[PDB]
Design a protein around this ligand. Structure first.
Ligand SMILES: [Zn+2]
Length: 61
């Protein structure tokens, strides 16, 4: 599966490498940006499953 995609940003990356993916996730704003993805999922508030995936993704303690 070439090319990478960020469901939180609704965009399609072109270089799915180990530095490009981390380069895309190298800004504290990316966390607040995720709220825009699940802001209207069901007219409610869902700020729990994000910490489980943002912290337990690959190398987060
Ligand atoms: Zn993103």
């Amino acid at each position: 599966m070439p090319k990478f995609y960020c469901d939180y940003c609704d965009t399609y990356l072109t270089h799915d490498s180990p530095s490009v993916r981390k380069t895309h996730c190298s800004g504290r704003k990316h966390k607040e940006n995720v709220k825009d993805y699940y802001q209207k999922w069901m007219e409610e508030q869902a700020q729990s499953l994000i910490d489980k995936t943002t912290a337990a993704f690959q190398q987060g303690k």
